Motif scaffolding. Structure first.
Motif, PDB file in Angstrom:
ATOM      1  N   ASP A  55       3.885  -2.466  -2.728  1.00  0.00           N
ATOM      2  CA  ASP A  55       2.641  -2.362  -3.221  1.00  0.00           C
ATOM      3  C   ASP A  55       1.860  -2.733  -2.125  1.00  0.00           C
ATOM      4  OD1 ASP A  55       3.478  -2.504  -5.934  1.00  0.00           O
ATOM      5  OD2 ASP A  55       3.102  -4.500  -6.487  1.00  0.00           O
ATOM      6  N   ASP A  56       0.341  -2.393  -2.301  1.00  0.00           N
ATOM      7  CA  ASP A  56      -0.649  -2.531  -1.035  1.00  0.00           C
ATOM      8  C   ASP A  56      -0.920  -3.862  -1.092  1.00  0.00           C
ATOM      9  OD1 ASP A  56      -2.458  -2.418   0.848  1.00  0.00           O
ATOM     10  OD2 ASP A  56      -3.491  -0.860  -0.103  1.00  0.00           O
ATOM     11  N   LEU A  57      -0.317  -4.807  -0.269  1.00  0.00           N
ATOM     12  CA  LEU A  57      -0.588  -6.072  -0.119  1.00  0.00           C
ATOM     13  C   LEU A  57      -1.544  -6.364   1.333  1.00  0.00           C
ATOM     14  CD1 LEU A  57       2.679  -7.909  -1.051  1.00  0.00           C
ATOM     15  CD2 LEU A  57       0.941  -7.100  -2.423  1.00  0.00           C
ATOM     16  N   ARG A  58      -2.064  -5.323   1.845  1.00  0.00           N
ATOM     17  CA  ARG A  58      -2.687  -5.446   3.035  1.00  0.00           C
ATOM     18  C   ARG A  58      -3.887  -6.449   3.103  1.00  0.00           C
ATOM     19  NH1 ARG A  58      -4.708   0.236   4.294  1.00  0.00           N
ATOM     20  NH2 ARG A  58      -4.708   0.626   2.110  1.00  0.00           N
ATOM     21  N   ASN A  59      -4.699  -6.520   1.900  1.00  0.00           N
ATOM     22  CA  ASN A  59      -5.801  -7.506   1.755  1.00  0.00           C
ATOM     23  C   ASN A  59      -5.070  -8.995   1.892  1.00  0.00           C
ATOM     24  OD1 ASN A  59      -7.677  -5.488   1.473  1.00  0.00           O
ATOM     25  ND2 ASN A  59      -7.945  -6.041  -0.814  1.00  0.00           N
ATOM     26  N   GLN A  60      -3.913  -9.202   1.460  1.00  0.00           N
ATOM     27  CA  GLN A  60      -3.454 -10.589   1.497  1.00  0.00           C
ATOM     28  C   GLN A  60      -2.966 -10.792   2.712  1.00  0.00           C
ATOM     29  OE1 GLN A  60      -1.967  -9.302  -2.716  1.00  0.00           O
ATOM     30  NE2 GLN A  60      -3.135  -8.243  -1.449  1.00  0.00           N
ATOM     31  N   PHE A  61      -2.314  -9.732   3.311  1.00  0.00           N
ATOM     32  CA  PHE A  61      -1.768  -9.814   4.744  1.00  0.00           C
ATOM     33  C   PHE A  61      -2.789  -9.945   5.630  1.00  0.00           C
ATOM     34  CE2 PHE A  61       0.862  -9.019   8.701  1.00  0.00           C
ATOM     35  CZ  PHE A  61       1.669  -9.802   8.454  1.00  0.00           C
ATOM     36  N   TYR A  62      -3.857  -9.385   5.492  1.00  0.00           N
ATOM     37  CA  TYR A  62      -5.115  -9.401   6.391  1.00  0.00           C
ATOM     38  C   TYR A  62      -5.712 -10.850   6.480  1.00  0.00           C
ATOM     39  CZ  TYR A  62      -9.787  -8.536   8.158  1.00  0.00           C
ATOM     40  OH  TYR A  62     -11.027  -8.532   8.999  1.00  0.00           O
ATOM     41  N   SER A  63      -6.032 -11.415   5.151  1.00  0.00           N
ATOM     42  CA  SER A  63      -6.212 -12.818   5.201  1.00  0.00           C
ATOM     43  C   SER A  63      -5.564 -13.669   5.993  1.00  0.00           C
ATOM     44  CB  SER A  63      -6.579 -13.126   3.619  1.00  0.00           C
ATOM     45  OG  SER A  63      -6.914 -14.228   3.364  1.00  0.00           O
ATOM     46  N   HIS A  64      -4.201 -13.401   5.756  1.00  0.00           N
ATOM     47  CA  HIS A  64      -3.339 -14.554   6.283  1.00  0.00           C
ATOM     48  C   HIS A  64      -3.451 -14.348   7.788  1.00  0.00           C
ATOM     49  CE1 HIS A  64       0.192 -16.488   8.023  1.00  0.00           C
ATOM     50  NE2 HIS A  64       0.551 -15.310   8.659  1.00  0.00           N
ATOM     51  N   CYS A  65      -3.347 -12.971   8.550  1.00  0.00           N
ATOM     52  CA  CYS A  65      -3.429 -12.977   9.945  1.00  0.00           C
ATOM     53  C   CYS A  65      -5.004 -13.566  10.416  1.00  0.00           C
ATOM     54  CB  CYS A  65      -3.336 -11.320  10.476  1.00  0.00           C
ATOM     55  SG  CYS A  65      -1.519 -10.879  10.222  1.00  0.00           S
ATOM     56  N   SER A  66      -5.745 -13.325   9.690  1.00  0.00           N
ATOM     57  CA  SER A  66      -7.235 -13.889  10.002  1.00  0.00           C
ATOM     58  C   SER A  66      -7.334 -15.292   9.957  1.00  0.00           C
ATOM     59  CB  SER A  66      -8.304 -13.230   9.065  1.00  0.00           C
ATOM     60  OG  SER A  66      -8.483 -11.593   9.371  1.00  0.00           O
ATOM     61  N   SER A  67      -6.723 -15.829   9.021  1.00  0.00           N
ATOM     62  CA  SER A  67      -6.796 -17.181   8.905  1.00  0.00           C
ATOM     63  C   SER A  67      -6.269 -18.153  10.195  1.00  0.00           C
ATOM     64  CB  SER A  67      -6.066 -17.980   7.839  1.00  0.00           C
ATOM     65  OG  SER A  67      -4.651 -17.678   7.771  1.00  0.00           O
ATOM     66  N   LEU A  68      -5.595 -17.229  11.099  1.00  0.00           N
ATOM     67  CA  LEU A  68      -4.839 -17.544  12.223  1.00  0.00           C
ATOM     68  C   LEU A  68      -5.580 -17.274  13.281  1.00  0.00           C
ATOM     69  CD1 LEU A  68      -0.947 -16.933  11.454  1.00  0.00           C
ATOM     70  CD2 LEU A  68      -2.209 -19.111  11.035  1.00  0.00           C
ATOM     71  N   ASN A  69      -6.724 -16.626  13.143  1.00  0.00           N
ATOM     72  CA  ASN A  69      -7.355 -15.900  14.176  1.00  0.00           C
ATOM     73  C   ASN A  69      -6.907 -14.839  14.857  1.00  0.00           C
ATOM     74  OD1 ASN A  69     -10.220 -16.250  15.523  1.00  0.00           O
ATOM     75  ND2 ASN A  69      -9.150 -16.716  17.380  1.00  0.00           N
ATOM     76  N   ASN A  70      -6.151 -13.794  14.081  1.00  0.00           N
ATOM     77  CA  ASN A  70      -5.447 -12.883  14.710  1.00  0.00           C
ATOM     78  C   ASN A  70      -5.939 -11.595  13.984  1.00  0.00           C
ATOM     79  OD1 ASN A  70      -3.799 -14.478  16.361  1.00  0.00           O
ATOM     80  ND2 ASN A  70      -2.281 -14.504  14.613  1.00  0.00           N
ATOM     81  N   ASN A  71      -5.814 -10.470  14.664  1.00  0.00           N
ATOM     82  CA  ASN A  71      -5.927  -9.012  14.021  1.00  0.00           C
ATOM     83  C   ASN A  71      -4.774  -8.704  13.154  1.00  0.00           C
ATOM     84  OD1 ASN A  71      -8.108  -8.322  16.775  1.00  0.00           O
ATOM     85  ND2 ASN A  71      -8.738  -8.798  14.809  1.00  0.00           N
ATOM     86  N   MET A  72      -4.856  -7.595  12.472  1.00  0.00           N
ATOM     87  CA  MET A  72      -3.660  -6.875  11.788  1.00  0.00           C
ATOM     88  C   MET A  72      -3.703  -5.460  12.108  1.00  0.00           C
ATOM     89  SD  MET A  72      -2.996  -6.720   7.810  1.00  0.00           S
ATOM     90  CE  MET A  72      -4.209  -5.238   7.513  1.00  0.00           C
ATOM     91  N   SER A  73      -2.186  -5.060  12.149  1.00  0.00           N
ATOM     92  CA  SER A  73      -2.212  -3.665  12.599  1.00  0.00           C
ATOM     93  C   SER A  73      -1.209  -3.275  11.271  1.00  0.00           C
ATOM     94  CB  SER A  73      -1.657  -3.156  14.023  1.00  0.00           C
ATOM     95  OG  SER A  73      -2.523  -3.486  14.827  1.00  0.00           O
ATOM     96  N   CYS A  74      -1.259  -1.970  10.709  1.00  0.00           N
ATOM     97  CA  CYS A  74      -0.241  -1.622   9.613  1.00  0.00           C
ATOM     98  C   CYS A  74      -0.165   0.004  10.002  1.00  0.00           C
ATOM     99  CB  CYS A  74      -0.979  -1.649   8.250  1.00  0.00           C
ATOM    100  SG  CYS A  74      -1.172  -3.373   7.707  1.00  0.00           S
ATOM    101  N   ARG A  75       1.041   0.268   9.690  1.00  0.00           N
ATOM    102  CA  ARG A  75       1.656   1.722   9.785  1.00  0.00           C
ATOM    103  C   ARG A  75       1.876   2.267   8.320  1.00  0.00           C
ATOM    104  NH1 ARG A  75       6.717   0.347  13.114  1.00  0.00           N
ATOM    105  NH2 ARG A  75       5.756   0.004  15.539  1.00  0.00           N
ATOM    106  N   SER A  76       1.357   3.241   7.899  1.00  0.00           N
ATOM    107  CA  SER A  76       1.543   3.908   6.537  1.00  0.00           C
ATOM    108  C   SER A  76       2.848   4.357   6.802  1.00  0.00           C
ATOM    109  CB  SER A  76       0.535   4.904   6.279  1.00  0.00           C
ATOM    110  OG  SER A  76       0.886   5.319   4.900  1.00  0.00           O
ATOM    111  N   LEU A  77       3.739   4.331   5.682  1.00  0.00           N
ATOM    112  CA  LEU A  77       4.975   4.970   5.772  1.00  0.00           C
ATOM    113  C   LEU A  77       5.045   6.167   5.018  1.00  0.00           C
ATOM    114  CD1 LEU A  77       7.301   1.739   5.746  1.00  0.00           C
ATOM    115  CD2 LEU A  77       5.960   2.738   7.595  1.00  0.00           C
ATOM    116  N   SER A  78       4.332   7.033   5.438  1.00  0.00           N
ATOM    117  CA  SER A  78       4.142   8.295   4.905  1.00  0.00           C
ATOM    118  C   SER A  78       5.420   9.453   5.064  1.00  0.00           C
ATOM    119  CB  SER A  78       2.912   8.920   5.265  1.00  0.00           C
ATOM    120  OG  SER A  78       2.805   9.020   6.730  1.00  0.00           O
ATOM    121  N   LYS A  79       5.550   9.980   3.676  1.00  0.00           N
ATOM    122  CA  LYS A  79       6.641  11.305   3.481  1.00  0.00           C
ATOM    123  C   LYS A  79       5.665  12.341   3.497  1.00  0.00           C
ATOM    124  CE  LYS A  79      10.521  13.161   0.714  1.00  0.00           C
ATOM    125  NZ  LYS A  79      11.197  13.555   2.289  1.00  0.00           N
TER     126      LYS A  79
END
Length: 79
Positions: A55-79
Motif C-alpha cells: 500500500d502507498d504509505l509514503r505520506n506516513q513514512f514521510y511524516s516520520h522521517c520529517s518528525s526526526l528532521n530528516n528527508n525521505m527517499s523512495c524507489r518505486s518497485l516497478s515491473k
C-alpha cells in the motif's frame, strides 16, 4: 500485496528510507524507528536498512522521517 510484503518483503511496491539533511546519507536507525511494528503493513529490511510496503504509505513514512528532521527517499518497485 500486503500479505507477502509485510510478511516476507515480497511483492512490495515501495522501498523507502530516511536520509540525513546536507549529506544525503541513509539513516538506518531512523528508518527502523518508523517501520515494521511502527507502521502497519510495512516490512523492515535489516540487510538494506530500508522500509518496504505494498500500500502507498509514503505520506506516513514521510511524516516520520520529517518528525526526526530528516528527508525521505523512495524507489518505486516497478515491473
Amino acid at each position: 500485496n500486503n500479505a507477502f510484503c509485510a510478511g516476507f518483503g515480497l511483492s512490495c511496491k515501495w522501498e523507502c528510507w530516511c536520509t540525513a539533511h546536507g549529506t544525503g546519507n541513509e539513516l538506518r536507525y531512523a528508518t527502523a524507528a518508523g517501520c515494521g511494528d511502527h507502521l502497519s503493513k510495512s516490512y523492515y529490511d535489516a540487510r538494506a536498512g530500508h522500509c518496504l510496503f505494498s500500500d502507498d504509505l509514503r505520506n506516513q513514512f514521510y511524516s516520520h522521517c520529517s518528525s526526526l528532521n530528516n528527508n525521505m527517499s523512495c524507489r518505486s518497485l516497478s515491473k
